[PDB]
Design a protein around this ligand. Structure first.
Ligand SMILES: NC(=O)c1ccc[n+]([C@@H]2O[C@H](COP(=O)([O-])OP(=O)(O)OC[C@H]3O[C@@H](n4cnc5c(N)ncnc54)[C@H](OP(=O)(O)O)[C@@H]3O)[C@@H](O)[C@H]2O)c1
Ligand SMILES: CCc1nc(N)nc(N)c1OCCCOc1ccccc1CCC(=O)O
Length: 165
């Protein structure tokens, strides 16, 4: 069951070790995760920190088919094709389904408001570094399921987790 009144969800991909980002990029190749990310977010509102906006390739700025919302404390930051807001509150003003798409700073900020998480886990040798962007923890309030391990065209093992509360 999926709730549809001010539903806030978080969607991320992470290594088993908990890394979501390094040096400004997502440090692995899983094309099936791009497919999975689009499948969930397409047509919905997407919320993202300024760093994540910067990390997008110009060919996906803004993310097509989604209402793009960008969080920045910088007064007057321009995000062409996206709405820029200065608080988590202004970001989540819409009642339509809204997916927080990263990065770590925004996951940590939106997590008390979220009632769904869609997590890709990637089995990649990626020992965590203090400068990485890291995955948010999931406490015991979450119910959910975990898919089977699959193998990517890139050779990496991955699997999908889906949680809710
Ligand atoms: N694996 C995944 O699923 C995934 C998904 C998305 C991103 N990533 C990776 O994660 C990294 C980015 O994550 P990050 O945590 O470093 O950055 P981030 O969360 O994407 O963005 C950080 C920025 O958000 C703004 N911000 C934060 N809190 C705010 C608040 N309360 N009010 C207003 N604005 C606020 C600030 O922008 P200003 O400095 O402009 O003020 C801050 O610098 C990148 O390497 C990216 O590739 C991975
Ligand atoms: C696809 C990576 C990704 N995967 C999951 N499961 N959750 C995210 N929040 C996420 O990050 C979304 C922001 C970065 O997205 C991209 C990064 C590099 C190339 C293309 C895209 C997205 C393009 C699109 O979705 O249309």
């Amino acid at each position: 069951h999926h709730h549809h009144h001010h539903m806030v969800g978080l969607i991320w991909a992470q290594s088993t070790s908990g890394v979501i980002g390094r040096g400004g990029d997502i440090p692995w190749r899983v094309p099936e995760d791009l497919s999975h990310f689009k499948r969930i977010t397409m047509g919905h509102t997407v919320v993202m920190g300024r760093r994540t906006w910067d990390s997008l390739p110009a060919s996906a700025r803004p993310l097509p088919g989604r209402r793009n919302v960008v969080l920045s404390r910088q007064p007057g930051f321009v995000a062409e094709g996206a709405e820029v807001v200065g608080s988590l509150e202004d970001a989540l003003t819409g009642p339509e389904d809204t997916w927080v798409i990263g990065g770590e700073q925004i996951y940590t900020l939106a997590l008390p408001r979220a009632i769904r998480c869609e997590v890709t886990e990637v089995d990649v040798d990626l020992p965590r570094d203090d400068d990485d962007a890291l995955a948010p923890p999931l406490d015991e309030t979450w119910q959910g399921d975990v898919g089977e391990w699959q193998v990517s065209r890139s050779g990496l093992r991955y699997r999908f987790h889906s949680y809710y509360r």
